[PDB]
Amino acid sequence: MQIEVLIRNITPIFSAAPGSYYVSLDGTINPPQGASRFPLTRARTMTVVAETGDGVAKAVPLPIVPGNTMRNLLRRTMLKDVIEPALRDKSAQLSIGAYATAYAGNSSGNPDGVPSSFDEIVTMRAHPFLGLFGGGPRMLQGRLMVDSLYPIHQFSQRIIGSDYINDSIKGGITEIVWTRRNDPILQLGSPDDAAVIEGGAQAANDWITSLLATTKAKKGKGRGLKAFNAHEVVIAGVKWLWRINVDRPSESQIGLILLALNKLANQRIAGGHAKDYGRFVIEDVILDGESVWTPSGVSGQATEQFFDAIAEALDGMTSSEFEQFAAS
């Protein structure tokens, strides 16, 4: 079962790329030693081959959101929006092993390695939630195969396809946002400001003297609060395509996926919680080539069976199933 979700991000999407990369004030990535350098946290870029500038094949980087991040976002959305309220309604309680399995598929609950009988595999892989995301001490094969969030760009034509050519962006989609942290003590201006500080003026004087001495020592050869740097993000408004496939899905699993897609807009993508990065709105959801996204979320006469099945599953779901899956 193929799920095609068209995602447009209202706010920039920031997936931090590993590594210590530098940038200058003018915007030159990795400036030479001559000019000043400031730390930069670039976006997650994947090397892809594309026909750039009428070339036969060019390995150009493409800013994407990692597929594992999308998988974890879907899992967290399910847990925090349908699974956890359903278990709370029954006053269910989970041990550490079951909870770790449910939230990250971590086998710490029973790292011995437990055999699974064929009947047990049949029963558990049919679970509405744990079947999609395999793991735990048993560590099955999940039925969910979610792709990365490839932007609809010129370089992603051979990964996305030509079905959504109308929304492609020709130029670059990355922008550098500069951050700064200021020492609050240096911004005091009157004894009224320093009234709340227990040391009053003396504490601020000692703080400023220590800062000056540390700065002088560092210039001659403990880190203060003051810091200036930038992080690279993907510009807002770019459309993204998310491809989700479920292998041999039951009605309950598809219903759960649809519920998560309904509640997915409330969550964020990748990082940037402080700056409200990653906010997005679902534009279209496609089920096996059939559009299902109504303005009131995923609905229609062709998905009532999935919603009914998942509602029935939520009605009878208990923590004992999670414990059995986690071998706790």
Next chain:
Amino acid sequence: MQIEVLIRNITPIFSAAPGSYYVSLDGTINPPQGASRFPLTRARTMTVVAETGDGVAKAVPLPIVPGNTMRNLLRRTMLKDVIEPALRDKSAQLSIGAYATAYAGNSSGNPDGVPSSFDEIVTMRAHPFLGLFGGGPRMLQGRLMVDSLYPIHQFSQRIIGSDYINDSIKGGIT
């Protein structure tokens, strides 16, 4: 919980864009070397995707206020007008480190790197002020998702939605 604040600025807003920029007397940005150039500190613009009547989506600059700057503005406003008066009413004193962390999220540039206890995390995230911003020597995820200040413009229609089209401005605002 979503909060949308509609702001009309009485006086011009000037957020410095880092980096050196030059302009001639006529108004041409980055003039040719033959003509006279003068230093210019541009207003910060973040590249955004804007759709036009032609249906093509293109990347255009948009003068905005950074999310970090006015997040700090909100934090300072809360501290100055709500938190600190309440503390001073009961003669409560904060240490220099506590004040620094309250106003900037950290007492120093080096984070502790030691995990926090669960009860401490719950208590801090239930704090009216510390719960919103978090931070501290041990990184605590705050509850406040704060966004930048987007002007209601034809370029920002895709970003801010179409429900504020009645207040949009067509031409350049810089």
Next chain:
Amino acid sequence: MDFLKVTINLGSPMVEPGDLFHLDALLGALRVSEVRAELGDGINPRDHHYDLPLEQYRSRSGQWVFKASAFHINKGAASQNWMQTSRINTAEAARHRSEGFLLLRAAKPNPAGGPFKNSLYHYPLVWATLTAYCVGDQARIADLLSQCRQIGGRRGVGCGRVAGFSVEVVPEVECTWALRAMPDDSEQSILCGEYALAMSALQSPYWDRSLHKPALVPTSLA
């Protein structure tokens, strides 16, 4: 019964296999997928992964392998080191612990190890055209590869989508099926190039360490 060349084209980068990626293993996985769709998930996978349209080579000692060479890796771009992590949200777990959803008495998470361990791992991603040589039925192999969508590994996160495939009959002189894990006492005349002795499994599954045997592994393919 016929000599074949299998070509696979990628629409997404795949995980570069650390060890040999064998055509017979992929065909067995696809056959197991077929019998799963036809019977269900209660089947024993070891009862259907040898029903492949490939004829077998048997050595003096009875050790047998499929005549299906390991996939050749030709890279259209430099390998990219892909980074992935794993973490349980500590604030979310703390909230659940407060509300009784989680039964944890421990005071603190331990990012170094335990239930709340943060882990960092890497695997390489490559753009390649997968070419391998085998002896079998063209129609049945093409039918099996028709249902294959992803190649290599890390398929849960969508690595190695198949843009297309092609199966062609080629002269024997081009390249043999021997570029695989052959048994220890295989005849020298049928081996293409140098063969280093190492430990690997001869029949799929190839990750089962209990099935590992001393085998001749091609040096120019590992």
Next chain:
Amino acid sequence: IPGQSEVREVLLPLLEQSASAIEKGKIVFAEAATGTGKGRMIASLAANAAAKGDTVVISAPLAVTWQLIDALKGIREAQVAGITLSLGRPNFVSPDRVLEWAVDNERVELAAWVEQGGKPLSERTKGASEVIEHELCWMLEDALVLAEDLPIDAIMLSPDDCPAQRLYKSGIVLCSHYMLAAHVRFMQLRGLQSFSLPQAIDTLIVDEAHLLEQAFAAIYSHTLRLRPLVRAIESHVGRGKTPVVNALNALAQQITRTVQQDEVPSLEPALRDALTALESIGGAKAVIRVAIRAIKDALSGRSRLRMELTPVRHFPMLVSGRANLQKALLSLWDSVAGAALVSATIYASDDHAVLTRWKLEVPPARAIYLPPVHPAWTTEPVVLHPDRNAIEPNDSPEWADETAGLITKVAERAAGGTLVLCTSYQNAELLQGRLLAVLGERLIVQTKVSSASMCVAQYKALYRAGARPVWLGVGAAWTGIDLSDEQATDPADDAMLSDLVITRLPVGLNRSLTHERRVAIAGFKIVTLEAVWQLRQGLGRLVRRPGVKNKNLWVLDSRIGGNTPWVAPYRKLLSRYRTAPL
């Protein structure tokens, strides 16, 4: 499949699956090479559709429409369903204005034809009116055949101005691309004139669909024609001429000075002034009504304004029209009709007909691709001479001199009739002067009036006369005209188009605003492959009959020799053809 008797071997593997996909509701894309028997296989598909009950519609240019009519008339299983015609106004003559024009010129042939009733005289029109049993009058084809002395566009059915008029509303439907354009206009405007086309048809076939997109752009784009409009007003309009031309020229000068030298705010005052003044605007009222429609189309707010002075004549010009044809217009066609289409330039070398799917909006799941085909007698019997051009194909006189010398030695070496492919009138006029010194009368070139109406027939007659004529095609000759020696039924004569030379790639021949939208969305890649399409289309003139044995080709562009990266697809395309072993 009925009607498969005349289907050739090359079309056999594709015809059955194309027919099967019709009832599947899937739109399919095919490349029936010119000279492979397109007309009769289109007719066979139409007969198949008519046999199963649903009405049939076919879209084609007028000349190939006549050709297809000739092919389909012999098919009984196509004749079982009622066959209807096209109802285009310029497809006929005024005829009262035409009658008076012929009377004043004493052309008794035209006068006799119109007074008889304007009944068919040409073979194509006679067949389409007799075998199809459709009473017709005043058709412009017969008037053109009778006399070529009617270059003006005033020869056109007056809106106030017949048995054909009755048959407008009185199975198989014959129409062009622009009939479909008019009907999709009808649906989009009223659903959201000549309404004979059913509002929902289960089968449509287009023999030339690569040019359907530009036709839909043309119908959805209205040209101001401002400078020719004011010139015609000054020459003809006399009703308060002075203030009207004052206002119109003020508009022209103001837009030229401000914009050239309703999306644009500065165009708003000009639009208001045009709305107020041009309403002041006789039988020539349509010449002003077209400009009025262009003005209100610009006012509609759904249009994009493109304006610039003419590079050659420096006449101010304004272009307005909808660039957003990709959302509701073609999708309306897809919803209305399940159809198929054919064009020789559908599938590109690496695009895999994506450009077709984008230009002609097709649902992603409804589109089905088809393998490419090509007969052996289309690529083998021609060799390319390595005589490349040494100068950039600009308008410099020295480049014209060198190109003229090269093509002059080619013409001296030419075995028989030859075609030199010129992109624009600017290059031809710059080039014809040097040629006329040596070639003399042997060279014949198009003009603003001179076109395939009589020039192709004159070239055919002169070639049969042994003059070894040279046809300097300009734009029109790039597509549609036939250069197969049909009378010489060997068929391998290879003399009427023994040799042909290309002057440019070309680059950016298409100037539709939709093309501008596409190049903005996708970049310079789309225009390069569109030019590859054009180059392949130009090669379509080389062969239109099977069994051609020996022809020659010349390439004249320094860019192909300059090894610039972007001409790689042209190198790949020409590499299919063996070079001349010089």
Next chain:
DNA sequence: ACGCACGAAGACCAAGTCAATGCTTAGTCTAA
């Protein structure tokens, strides 16, 4: 009353890198 919490501890060598994408020029008339 076995299960879980929680600090101390024990391996301990240690570099060179940090761009990956630029590209041109006017014919159509076959629906109101």
